[PDB]
C-alpha cells in the first residue's frame, strides 16, 4: 500500500518498493557501501567483498557514491572508477541485490568538495545564477543511469531500480547544502527541483527517492520536528531514511551503552511512526562503528536494539559505510569486518539471524 512518488515507475522499481513494504515486518536487509570496489586489505578484484570474505554472502543492499561524476571525472571522490561501478551495479542487481546511490556533490561556487561550506544552494535552484550548472550536474547522472540499461531484442530498455539518496544529512552543518549554509526553503527548492528534473523533465522511471537526516542533530525530545527540518513533502520522498552513527558508539557520545542502545531503538521507533503516518517505508540508511572497536557490535549494538521494539523493527534495511583501503588511504576507516577483524564472528552470527537478510537469502524482490 505504500506507493511511489513516480506513478509510472518501472515494473521492477514498483516491485522492489512493494516487496520492501512486505518484508520489513519480519526482516532486515543488510547493506554495505562500496562493497565490491575494495576492502581494507585489498583492491582490484572485480568480484570480491570484505562482507562476503567473512560470511560467504554479499550484502543485500549495495551502496555507491557519485561525487565527482558531475565534474566529468572518470572516478569518484574515493577513486572508484565509474565504469567499474556500473559493472558492479549491474552485477549486484543481476543477483537480486538492491542498489542505493548517494552523492557528495562538489561545491559549485568554490570548487571545494561537499565539506566546503561555501554557500551555493541559492545559486543552484531555479532562478539562481548557476541553475544551468545544477542541470548540467544532474545530466551527468542521467547519462550514468543510461549506462546501466540493457536493451532487449525488441528494443525495450531495462534498468536496475535505484534508491537515490541525494542531499543527505541536510540538518547537519557539515555539507554546503546543510543547515547554516542554505536556507530551509532553498533546500526544499533544491530537492523538489531534483525530483522534477529527473522524474518529469528527463523521464527517469527507475528511481526511488530517499530522504536522510542525521540523527546526531535531532533533539530526541522533539524528534519529529527535528526530522522534518527541510522536509520537501510526501510527493517528493519514498523512503524515510536516517543516518545514525551517534547511538552506535560514537566516541564523542558520553551516554552509556545502555542509554545509546535505548536511543537507537527510540530513534527507529519514531522513524517508523513517521513513515507509517506518511505511507512510506523507513530505513537506517547509514550507520556503523568506525574500525569496529566495539565487542559484539552487530548483535549487541545493532540487531538487538532494532529488534527490541515492534515499531523499531519495521525498518526495511540498514547500511553500514565503506571499508576504506588502508594501503591507499593511509589510515584505518571501516564499518564492516574482514577476515581476522575482532567482530568477524559476531558478524557471522548476525548474518545467521533469521531476521537479517544478505543477498543470498533475498526473496525475488523484482517481481
Ligand atoms: Na540471515
Q: Are 267 and 223 in contact (CB under 8 A)?
A: yes
Which residues are tagged catalytic?
Answer: 169, 286
Q: In the numeric block, which cell numbers belong to residue 341?
A: 577483524
**Shortest CA distance to 292 belongs to which of 29, 28, 32, 27?**
32
Resolution at which this structure was determined, Å: 1.7
Helix or strand (DSSP H, E) at 281: strand 281-282
Task: Give me ligand 1 centre to Cα 85, in Å.
Answer: 26
Q: In the numeric block, which cell numbers belong to residue 15?
A: 516491485
d(Cα 172, Cα 187) in Å, to the nearest integer? 12
Task: Give me ligand 1 centre to Cα 315, in Å.
Answer: 16
Experimental technique: X-ray
Task: Give me ligand 1 centre to Cα 91, in Å.
Answer: 21
- Coil, strand, or helix at residue 120? coil
**Terminus-to-terminus CA distance in the chain, angstroms?**
16
Strand locations in 60-185, DSSP E? 61-65, 98-102, 150-151, 157-158, 162-165
**Shortest CA distance to 190 belongs to which of 114, 125, 102?**
125
Angle at 278 between CA 223 and CA 287, to 5 degrees: 50
Task: Give me ligand 1 centre to Cα 349, in Å.
Answer: 8
For residue 310, count CB atoms less than 10 angstroms from its CB and return exposed for 0-12, middle for 13-18, buried for 19 or more: exposed
Task: Give me ligand 1 centre to Cα 350, in Å.
Answer: 7
Residue-range domain boundaries for the chain: 1-367
Contacts of 222 (CB under 8 A, 6+ apart): none
Contacts of 249 (CB under 8 A, 6+ apart): 257, 260, 289, 293, 294, 297, 301
Arch. (CATH architecture) of 1-367:
Alpha-Beta Barrel (3.20)
Amino acid at each position: 500500500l505504500p506507493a511511489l512518488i513516480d506513478t509510472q515507475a518501472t515494473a521492477e522499481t514498483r516491485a522492489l518498493y512493494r516487496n520492501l513494504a512486505k518484508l520489513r515486518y519480519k526482516h532486515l536487509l543488510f547493506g554495505h557501501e562500496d562493497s565490491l570496489a575494495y576492502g581494507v586489505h585489498w583492491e582490484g578484484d572485480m568480484d570480491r567483498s570484505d562482507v562476503r570474505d567473512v560470511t560467504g554472502a554479499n550484502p543485500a543492499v549495495y551502496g555507491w557514491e557519485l561525487g565527482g561524476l558531475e565534474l566529468g571525472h572518470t572516478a569518484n571522490l574515493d577513486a572508484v572508477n565509474f565504469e567499474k561501478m556500473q559493472h558492479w551495479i549491474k552485477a549486484g542487481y543481476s543477483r537480486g541485490g538492491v542498489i542505493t546511490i548517494s552523492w557528495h556533490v562538489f561545491n559549485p561556487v568554490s570548487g571545494g568538495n561537499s565539506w566546503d561550506k561555501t554557500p551555493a544552494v541559492h545559486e543552484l535552484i531555479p532562478g539562481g545564477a548557476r541553475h544551468a550548472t545544477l542541470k548540467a550536474y544532474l545530466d551527468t547522472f542521467v547519462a550514468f543511469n543510461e549506462g546501466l540499461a540493457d536493451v532487449d531484442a525488441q528494443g525495450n530498455k531495462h534498468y536496475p531500480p535505484i534508491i537515490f539518496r541525494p542531499w543527505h544529512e541536510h540538518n547537519g552543518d557539515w555539507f554546503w547544502w546543510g543547515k547554516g549554509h542554505a536556507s530551509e526553503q532553498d533546500y526544499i527548492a533544491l530537492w523538489r527541483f531534483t525530483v522534477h528534473y529527473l522524474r518529469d523533465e528527463k523521464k527517469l522511471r527507475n528511481l526511488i527517492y530517499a530522504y536522510s537526516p542525521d540523527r546526531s542533530r535531532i533533539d530526541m525530545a522533539n524528534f519529529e520536528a527535528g526530522y522534518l527540518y527541510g522536509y520537501p513533502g510526501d510527493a517528493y520522498v519514498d523512503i524515510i531514511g536516517l543516518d545514525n552513527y551517534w547511538d552506535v558508539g560514537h566516541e564523542a557520545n558520553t551516554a552509556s551503552a545502555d542509554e545509546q542502545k535505548a536511543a537507537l531503538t527510540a530513534s527507529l521507533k519514531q522513524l517508523v511512526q513517521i513513515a507509517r503516518s506518511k505511507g512510506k517505508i523507513a530505513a537506517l540508511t547509514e550507520t556503523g562503528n568506525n574500525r569496529l572497536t566495539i565487542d559484539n557490535f552487530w548483535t549487541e549494538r545493532l540487531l538487538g536494539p532494532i529488534s527490541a521494539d515492534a515499531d523499531a523493527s519495521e525498518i526495511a534495511y540498514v547500511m553500514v559505510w565503506r571499508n576504506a583501503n588502508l594501503a591507499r588511504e593511509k589510515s584505518e576507516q571501516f564499518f564492516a569486518p574482514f577476515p581476522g577483524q575482532a567482530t568477524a564472528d559476531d558478524f557471522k552470527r548476525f548474518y545467521q539471524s533469521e531476521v537479517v537478510l544478505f543477498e543470498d537469502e533475498l526473496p525475488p524482490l523484482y517481481r
